[PDB]
């Protein structure tokens, strides 16, 4: 009987360079009133080898949430290319959008992001040193993979 | 209580003496007169020294760990104040952990990692943690003693431990050991259905069931998909139609078969995609090395199904089938390898048998979980123990109906036959779904007492030439500590007054599948690294 | 048939064969020829009694049917502007052959068969004594024939003679029946015609009979308020049922299912099922167990209205008469796992508590009548206890086996080992076998068996195959075979206790769920006190009255092609 | 202005084997409480040539009759076969209902009845004798004929 | 899942002398089709003392019974006054309306009947020997007491 439920998520700038900030549209329906401020986070998995390279893009504190269907925007700065390793820069990765309440997480709407090279010469000849300025990020918005957990939505 | 802590801090009584006193060890001839007399006098205060000690460290850690331009001052062991007290407290803590006095070993290890991984302070009298230097030194001193547990963790977590700067700063020898670790670790029919109308109706209901499951598979990850609104009407109509023509037995057999079949389940691009897909279904991530019971992935569906069914008939038939299957599986021979010769030509055989066991065990866990979910479903609720008195009526009422599965007898037979590795894990899975009034009945009280005795008998330092392999000990200790740290189980319960087990059957993959919270340690390190860059 | 014919020749005495069937020890008086013949025919044993019973059923088929001005019509004032009441179109000789013992054919054969039948019934070889007594009464009240080779029933004279011959042996059972049935037997003409002595004894017996809450219990405060609301709702639905449970068309489901399900849901919400089950059981026990001449006549009429189903013979299936019905419907309409589990727990607790009551009975000292109240007190106490137990047990057995009961007879001879293995795992809701054993050991059968029979009558078609319930039924079979209504050993068990236990056990052994072959398969203290009286016997077994009805029916039919009315359409 | 006004005459058990009593469920309207009592009488036309063979099934009297929409059900016996002339009765005849108020008649209803046999042979080779063992009378055509007459409603 | 259900039953002309025949209108709703004919019976409780004096007024067979809402009437001859005892003639008795299928009963809608004397002198001076010609039988139709049993509605 979670007070907050989530519904369709629409990523707007799905076609963009590697430096364009993220932009998500989440339609979360809250049933009754909350007592604190919802905390949203974006975690970009810099490398598939391990979490060591995870980047916390930006954490927002949004809680004007009377019952009803609500909206906001979650623009966050692009990941710093320096930390992402070389091999995983050119491959396909995932970006996780998480939400927490009272420091407890309850939804992880994810997204499979891909990183190609736009110019044909680059795909034909992948440079040894990735050049992020000419890298293209496509987020597969058609196949979101959400996972939901049960938490205690108590008063205190 | 505080007096005993101060006395220990002053070194009047050795740490070994007090730890032995807490462990109820026999008084040997070497016991010192003064220390023995003092400990005997304070015996009245025993049974609460250790929880208070844990609370004291938790409280003093609050200043170093958040909640429970700025530069990052690197931690160095030179600028350490009251080094003697920190060293003594760390030694006592290590002795306590190594004797299994604490409920959950990995909870304590997680706390140690948190102390070792403290960023900055947040704004007997003198606190024991004046700066990150003190907490880091304490954490490294405690971790130094515990090497086997760390050595047997994942390869990745070993690597993150290996590259940690603070460990190198405070204990180069430990780093050389865990480096060697990462190194080696990387070097590796028409008769069944009465009449014919019933057979036809079962065919339709099976078709409807597979249809709803396919709908779930297609739609159980899209945002907004609620199981109730989606499938409750269809599941309830199916339950009614199946109860009509008394065909619940066949449908429950199909249900259990599918449950076991499903839940138990460029090339480089595919492998990396698999790792990402594992990332998608990663645990709750919020924290806690002792998370509450949950149904990850396909299992979730079935739980929802049972909840939506809300059928007495189906629930009873499922309980019967699950009990039968669990008893059948627990009795499997599972002939393990005979450690003869060092020939490698028999390689495959080992894995064969091992895999078999793993499969069996996992299945058992799953089934047990669902059994414990449905057996105690009518009783579970947000109703903690009513009160100290006036509950004899409730205990009398609830102590009559026999348990759905004779778990006490199965546990006793398994322990006697030395099959703990196979009998305990699924029992823990079953019990994790109890209510707030189960840890009080004589039956389940005896069950918990037996589990406590077994846990106290599992110390990760001894060896008697073939008692129990280390990884088996780790698996059992982790599961038991997790069991003893669920809100339903009272906190005071722990503080109250040949063969499959001998052969190696649990490996790292099985350990991490059975206990998907060891990775928490790894997570912490990763977090630090990330926060080091940020 | 060969053994039956051999007995008809008087080669082997009826007593000898009867004792041989009972596996009695061979005494020194056993005859060589009879013993040899019975030993040779032992291969045909274990089915002789069933064969004899079947023979009577076929041969009874011929005796029973089959296996100027005018009035004034004050028009009813039921205008009810509705339905067809609406406007429309432009309207704007067969005689009763008296039974006589003279016209009897093969009197010897009838006498031998009747004696064998009486011996078999009186030794408890037959499963249900009262079923056989009902059949004997049916023979005694046969009107006319309907259109080894020679039939054993040539005329109504033969069947009436057989029935009276069988009844002659059984006088104690008849003597202890209701007053009304005693009167009907006494005034019966056929008894006087065929056996004046039996009718006179029954008349003497008839004359002799004529001569006689808080905030602490409920966790939190939301739970307290919601439980109060649900108790109010439960009492509202109960009052609605009481007001409307007999008017035509009132269906429990349509009437109350939505309300009961809503109550169930809100009550499961705040985990308050235990307290509601306590209230439910308390109400069940309090209600279900429960001019002056005008009041007595009204009571008799009201009893007539609520008489059990008339079609059902002396072995009717289990049923919930009157208020109990409501609760059954309730349990059916809730269809909630939580409520069912809590109800099973509560009923088990109440049954265990009641069955263990001491019930210190009177010590039979002196003949003083000043102690009247004491007698009445103790007897009433016991009766109350027993009735409550029966009720509770019945409901327990109704809900415990609810998921399994269904129109699915035993699957088949083979391929059922899987079902038995599956169903032999879950322990029984109530340890009925241990309770039965302890009751028998402690000599409390009158208190322990009846409620066990009520519990078991709601078993499944696969319950008689489980080892647990198989042993239970074997023990009940031994007990029933140990209850012969002719013996006495100076304080074993009072006659009426034996009658009650035998009736209940026979009814259990004549339920469709129990296989017919199960009964014929190979083989101080509360008891021994006058704790069961006629009222208690007829309350526990409201099918003995069947016998009375039969006699009454005959008399009524003494004073008395149907029609083919076609129903009107919508 | 009439105090009595029939409003239907349901036929009960229209398909009926012979010897079955006639059943008619009448519903009639009374507007004022007339003192006297009505007289409902039912006639079976035994033969179609003359009225001497007509047999009066029966004649009930009805009262008291207060104001309102009243009704009743009437059951007349089977026709007497003794006076039956010949097989002409098997031919379609009429059964009619007449109510005499103040002793004078004011209504008739026509219900031509197809008195039909049972056995198939009885239709292919019907016997000359009017055998009554098998027959199907009481089959009413459902034709509400109303021969209203101006009966005098004298106060005395 | 009873094949046959029952609804309101209206006893027609409940106020009548002791010789007036009974009149019931029963609207039984059948769900699907029956394979045999319902057997309806009237049991008049002559005396409350025992069933010995029960009078079976008339047993009717009703069919065929295809699905649908159906109704009919159950006229039966009045009880023979000879069998009714002396004391119980003037008191209140019961009349039972029963239905059976395959010799199995499933509804016994009953009725509390009363037997008064119309003229005031008879009530003031109740004659020792009841004279059935002047007794009035009133059927309390407002409080029917129905009882339902469960039977197997199988094909055979």
Numbering used by the authors:
A (entry chain E), D (entry chain D), E (entry chain C): 1 to 156
B (entry chain B): 1 to 68, 285 to 339, 355 to 419, 439 to 515, 535 to 766, 782 to 818
C (entry chain A): 2 to 68, 192 to 216, 285 to 339, 355 to 419, 438 to 515, 535 to 767, 782 to 818, 823 to 832
Sentences reproduced from the published study:
Codanin-1 (CDAN1) is an essential and ubiquitous protein named after congenital dyserythropoietic anemia type I, an autosomal recessive disease that manifests from mutations in CDAN1 or CDIN1 (CDAN1 interacting nuclease 1). CDAN1 interacts with CDIN1 and the paralogous histone H3-H4 chaperones ASF1A (Anti-Silencing Function 1 A) and ASF1B. We find that CDAN1 dimerizes and assembles into cytosolic complexes with CDIN1 and multiple copies of ASF1A/B. One CDAN1 can engage two ASF1 through two B-domains commonly found in ASF1 binding partners and two helices that mimic histone H3 binding. Based on homology searches, CDAN1 contains two MIF4G (middle domain of eukaryotic initiation factor 4G) domains (MIF4G1, MIF4G2), a three-helix bundle of unknown function (DUF3819), and an MA3 domain commonly found in MIF4G proteins.
To understand the interactions that mediate CDAN1 dimerization and ASF1A association, we determined single-particle cryo-EM structures of the C:C:A complex. 3D classification strategies allowed us to obtain cryo-EM maps at overall resolutions ranging from 3.0 to 3.5 Å of a CDAN1 dimer with either two or three ASF1A molecules clearly resolved. Surprisingly, even though CDAN1 homodimerizes, we consistently observed asymmetric assemblies during 2D and 3D classifications of our cryo-EM data. The asymmetry is explained by the association of two ASF1A molecules with one CDAN1 monomer and a single ASF1A with the other. In addition, this stoichiometry matches our SEC-MALS measurements supporting the predominant presence of three ASF1A in both the C:A and C:C:A complexes. In our cryo-EM maps, the two ASF1A molecules on one side of the complex appear to stack on top of each other on a platform formed primarily by the MIF4G2 domain of CDAN1. We refer to the ASF1A proximal to the CDAN1 core as ASF1A-1 and the distal ASF1A as ASF1A-2. With our cryo-EM maps, we could model both MIF4G domains of CDAN1. This showed that MIF4G2, including a conserved central extension (residues 645–675), mediates dimerization. In this placement, BDA1 makes canonical interactions with ASF1A-1, where the consecutive basic residues R825 and K826 interact with D58 and D37 of ASF1A-1, respectively. We assigned the previously identified B-domain sequence as BDA2 that interacts canonically with ASF1A-2, where the consecutive basic residues R195 and R196 interact with D58 and D37 of ASF1A-2, respectively.
